Design a protein around this ligand. Structure first.
Ligand SMILES: OC[C@H]1O[C@@H](O[C@H]2[C@H](O)[C@@H](O)[C@@H](O)O[C@@H]2CO)[C@H](O)[C@@H](O)[C@H]1O
Ligand SMILES: OC[C@H]1O[C@@H](O[C@H]2[C@H](O)[C@@H](O)[C@@H](O)O[C@@H]2CO)[C@H](O)[C@@H](O)[C@H]1O
Ligand SMILES: OC[C@H]1O[C@@H](O[C@H]2[C@H](O)[C@@H](O)[C@@H](O)O[C@@H]2CO)[C@H](O)[C@@H](O)[C@H]1O
Ligand SMILES: OC[C@H]1O[C@@H](O[C@H]2[C@H](O)[C@@H](O)[C@H](O)O[C@@H]2CO)[C@H](O)[C@@H](O)[C@H]1O
Ligand SMILES: [Ca+2]
Ligand SMILES: [Ca+2]
Ligand SMILES: [Ca+2]
Ligand SMILES: [Ca+2]
Ligand SMILES: [Mn+2]
Ligand SMILES: [Mn+2]
Ligand SMILES: [Mn+2]
Ligand SMILES: [Mn+2]
Lengths: 232, 232, 232, 232
């Protein structure tokens, strides 16, 4: 089997294993801050630096993965706690969209909310333009921030959220388990064919954005990941 | 919502939160040992004492849950490493089948592999009487040890194995991820309607068994669980 | 060259290849539990029965060795997780000190912390009488529990810890590598002249101790060893 | 803590984590073959694709690392079993030396035997130009194939060799334990200040070479690695 595994309990500036795109900063405590509270339409992205081969054209196999991470979103005076975080998977050449407006685009889509990526979002602002449900919600995104499926949720300022995602290559099922600070769990599952929506080599990371009036603290506290491809 | 959660870093035989059934024994190190090594057709099962309401006959809601556990399987000289461990769900009045042959029935089914349980087995002995794959495998069992679906795996004697399970109510999908000793992960997912197969109140637990020439050490080392049922 | 080698995947009581001294016991899963959670100054030690010739009289030659073993320390309710484990080397006639106080002496020293041995400790309790550093630590002990050198570490309750030790005869260098559950690694190395400090023949093994209020689970799970002596 | 760890039980063609340089081949068995048997002065090198940050210029820390791998050298009819394998560390931009003669340079140095690397060589041919010992041997090389230190060894055609290496940051000790086929162990250790000889970012890998008369099979069967850098 072909396996890729890593575990970050904290992050540091200058580790060749991570790629920073946009407004990302490394806090003195090892946390990663995704956006700049002082910039308009801020966008920050972090990616595992090595591309992962998620499917093989040779054999036809699709990797299975298990990953877990925890984050925290915190309110700041005078700005609308917006817009959220997104765990995403994109082609190896991935970059922040050319004239990114940030905001409800979450840093992975164009103005109309389209892009090339598969991801799980934690959205804290309702964009009628992207058909967002009326409350905070978790969503499964396939090439658009106009989620294929969403589930009501509640973002608590200063709360640490823990997340678990399992991607079962055979049923092509992607399942997510979110642990609220309060103990309750939130789950959402959806069949998504990675072999059909993405190249053989991809990048994994997190993205967050803000707007002019819409700004909040976005922190990535830990991330562990493992993928296994049944080789030839 | 109605949430139930617990977590055992270690077990003990005087705790009112656990039911012991059969040859179960707790070791001084806090681990649970499910079979008796010099006992023919040994069978032992552990259950969380308190029954969990997984569905409502009032609303029609079904719970979502997240559970992870770690076990260890080790060989004993002059005995075939058999039969395996099963994480199961059953009616609150569940008992070791009357006149159980242990072995390939894993302590959950009758001689012809039937019973009332939903589970995930870690089977290390291929019983053709139950249509067993020809290698170690992980399987999804719905009221029978004749697995709805299996996946080839490898049981490594003396290694600590970690399991993560997610049940999404809305898609009714059960997905599993097993982190092996060599780092590799194994997954399996299947759609199971709990409402249709099980009663409102159930009990969760582990069961292991063996035969006359087929015995091995079956240890449960830790277990955490959280279920959430929406009451609206 | 004269080579001695062994490998244990699990230990047994009826094994004349191993010397049991003190409170040691062998669990049904094949693990060695060095202390009695019930006794007050519990002391338990295990030694490979056969004496190893680590140096020659004829040629001032010292042997090189490579060894690896895994262990597990776990907390018990109402007792301070103390005192730690020690991999040691000593005279072939070695025995637990007379009227041993367990505790910070780790079952190898007298009350002032002196004895005849060379070892590597995994000290989880800070004894100022022995000038211990203020945190969990790994240490190099030369005839005293007042370490020649120490490095900060972290003992995780219920975690399997793996270690690898290399002793290089020309450099007279002793180095160790510890793999935490975390994936992180801790190392320590020190020049120790085995021929000036220990007799021609020795016995290798482990020891662990407890006190009145200070007690925890101390387990040895596996051990492989190889030593080679050039006789030219 | 900043950690990098990976485990290759077998190799595969197209894995983004491995860089091939020269005559390298991936066999149907997962083994890597470093040289081409039909070519004059063949050279094959394999590298972990990600640059690893071994020392930090911010803090003055050096990382410690533990690695183990196994190889196999096997004779081929009518040719002199030459020249050997080398485990090396070089600047991240490392490449096979322009116009390399293969042979005793081991694919890492120039004609005079100089280069920019740190490594452990398994040298099977005695090159008087690089002051080789008269027999097969293990040597520690610092920027030259004219080893800083060597120890006699014996290469056994078709035997699987296992090697364990520990680099302790604080003492700056590189320790190697080689396990021959006949169970005998060979050890070699040397103080090497990595922070003085190499840039902050490096690459790890293996290199093998041959000449017109000197050719043999050179296989890499597995490789596990872990390095930890104290960041604080
Ligand atoms: O207020 C948070 C949301 O703002 C929306 O953008 C605003 C911007 O904040 C503002 O100053 C104003 O001029 O109108 C824009 C549209 O309402 C973002 O589109 C949204 O994503 C949130 O961040
Ligand atoms: O607290 C654990 C440490 O105990 C120390 O011994 C104690 C003993 O535990 C206690 O209950 C009391 O009688 O005082 C003694 C002095 O601290 C040990 O010396 C130390 O090794 C730990 O086990
Ligand atoms: O015989 C193995 C060694 O060969 C040396 O190269 C030879 C070459 O093989 C031979 O045909 C003639 O060209 O002379 C050379 C010099 O003796 C290599 O230099 C050496 O490293 C081994 O491969
Ligand atoms: O061999 C392990 C395997 O045994 C099967 O039962 C055996 C039993 O070991 C033996 O005493 C008898 O002679 O034959 C039986 C049929 O092979 C079980 O069926 C199986 O589950 C395993 O435990
Ligand atoms: Ca939104
Ligand atoms: Ca079976
Ligand atoms: Ca101490
Ligand atoms: Ca040479
Ligand atoms: Mn949304
Ligand atoms: Mn089965
Ligand atoms: Mn100490
Ligand atoms: Mn040489």
């Amino acid at each position: 089997a072909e396996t890729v595994s890593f575990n970050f309990n904290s992050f540091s500036e200058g580790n060749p294993a991570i790629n920073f795109q946009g407004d990302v900063t490394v806090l003195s405590n090892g946390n990663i801050q995704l956006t700049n509270l002082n910039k308009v339409n801020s966008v920050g992205r972090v990616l595992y630096a090595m591309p992962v081969r998620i499917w093989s054209s040779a054999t036809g196999n699709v990797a299975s993965f298990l990953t877990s991470f925890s984050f925290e979103m915190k309110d700041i005076k005078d700005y609308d706690p917006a817009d959220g975080i997104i765990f995403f998977i994109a082609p190896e050449d991935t970059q922040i969209p050319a004239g990114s407006i940030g905001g409800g685009t979450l840093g992975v889509s164009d103005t109309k909310g389209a892009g090339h990526f598969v991801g799980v979002e934690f959205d804290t602002y309702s964009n009628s333009e992207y058909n967002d449900p009326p409350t905070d919600h978790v969503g499964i995104d396939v090439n658009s921030v106009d989620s294929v499926k969403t589930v009501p949720w509640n973002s608590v300022s200063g709360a640490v959220v823990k997340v678990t995602v399992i991607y079962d290559s055979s049923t092509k099922t992607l399942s997510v388990a979110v642990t609220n600070d309060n103990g309750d769990i939130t789950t959402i599952a959806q069949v998504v064919d990675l072999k059909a929506k993405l190249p053989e080599r991809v990048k994994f990371g997190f993205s967050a954005s803000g707007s002019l009036g819409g700004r909040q603290i976005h922190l990535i506290r830990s991330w562990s990941f493992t993928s296994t491809l049944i080789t030839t």
